[PDB]
Structures are given as structure tokens and as C-alpha cells.
Amino acid sequence: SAHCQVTGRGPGFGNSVSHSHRRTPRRWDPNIQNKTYYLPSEGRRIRLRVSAKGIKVIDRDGIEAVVARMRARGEKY
């Protein structure tokens, strides 16, 4: 995928099941979405690819904080 942006919750690769096994993965994706937000600092609307988890992070942590944390990682937002 375009890859998460605030955390880095990438995929994973499972395998087997019950009822006798069979070996066979099925990526365990993450739940990213395309929520947008508003930066009152620079007067702008930003769209991101963020999981619901990361939305939780935002609403109990801020957006400025998050973009600074992403600036660190230098994601091409």
C-alpha cells in the first residue's frame, strides 16, 4: 500500500488455519483510511493515510505534534 504515515503499521504475513492445515498466508493489512484534517497554523486542509489507531493518536495528542513527528521521518506528505 502507499504505507501508513504516522506510526508505520505495515502489513504482516499469516499462514495456516484450522480443520487440518494447508499452509497459506493472507497478509494481515492494517486499516488505513483517507481521513482529512485542517491545519489552523498554516491555514490548510491535509489528507493523510492513517489508521483508526492513528486517528486515536491524533485526537488525544494533536495534529501539529504529528506532522512534526512525521517531518522527522521525512515522509513526503
Binding site: Y38, G43, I55, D59, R60
Partner: protein
């Protein structure tokens, strides 16, 4: 989402109240309008609620209030406080819109919005005296006469 209301709303209460509501309501409707505030801290939330309430009450305007502010925008010279280097004639840091509007607060009276201030047309960071204009109305806009504190 534990948040402190700023205005009155259906089935919540009135301004100043404290409510535990649904997360998305508080996420999408209230909080990104400056109509509420998170409840994280006692005095922090208290001060933010008080100040936001005063500012929301004081920010209003109508078309005729714009027609009157179009006349009252020719105020006296509203000066601006500065820390910079007068060595070469360049300013250390760009000066806010809050500073200009609080100068108007303590000189002329109107406590306007930082948003509509055409500070770009001011071109701060050249030491001198910058003119200014503001989106008061759709069509009507008036001008202010300004000066700077020499550094």
C-alpha cells in the same frame, strides 16, 4: 470525548458546560470549529474555555458592522512592538497578526480576526512602515495608517 462546550447546542446544554459525548461528534463537528475543547487539565481547560468563550462572543460582525468598520478602519497610527537588529536594517523575526490586532485593541478598540489581515501586502521583514488592508466586506475594504518602533 470529554470536552468543555463553548456555545449552546441541542440536548447537550449551554456554554461552559462539561459533557462526555460520542467521539466522532466531537471529532468532526464541534472541535474543528472552535466550538469546544478537550478536557485534559483542570486549569488549562478552564483558561482555554474562558478565553475561547470571550473571543467567540467578541468575534461577531454583520454586513452593516462591516459598513461601519469600513469607516472606523482609518484609525490612529497603531504602533507595533519589535525586537530586531537595527545594525543593517533587517528584522530578526516576522511579527504576528495577534500583535497587530492587540495593538488595535490597546490603541483603537476593535479586536479583529487575524485571518483576514492582509499581512502579505504588508511585506514585513523590511524595516520601515508597512501599509495594510483587510477583507471587511465582500466589496468594501478600508485601509489603516501604520508605523513601526525603531530598533
Amino acid at each position: 470525548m470529554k470536552l468543555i462546550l463553548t456555545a449552546e447546542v441541542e440536548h447537550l446544554g449551554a456554554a461552559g458546560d462539561t459533557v462526555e459525548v460520542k467521539d466522532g461528534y466531537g471529532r468532526n463537528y464541534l472541535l474543528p470549529r472552535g466550538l469546544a475543547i478537550v478536557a485534559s487539565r483542570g486549569a488549562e481547560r478552564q483558561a482555554e474555555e474562558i478565553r475561547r468563550a470571550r473571543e467567540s462572543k467578541v468575534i461577531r460582525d454583520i454586513e452593516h458592522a462591516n459598513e461601519l468598520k469600513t469607516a472606523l478602519e482609518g484609525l490612529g497610527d497603531v504602533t507595533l512592538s519589535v525586537n530586531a537588529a537595527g545594525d543593517t536594517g533587517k528584522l530578526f523575526g516576522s511579527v504576528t497578526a495577534a500583535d497587530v490586532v492587540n495593538a488595535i485593541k490597546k490603541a483603537g478598540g476593535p479586536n479583529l480576526d487575524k485571518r483576514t489581515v492582509q499581512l502579505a501586502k504588508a511585506h514585513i521583514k523590511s524595516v520601515g512602515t508597512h501599509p495594510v488592508t483587510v477583507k471587511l466586506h465582500t466589496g468594501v475594504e478600508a485601509k489603516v495608517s501604520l508605523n513601526v518602533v525603531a530598533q
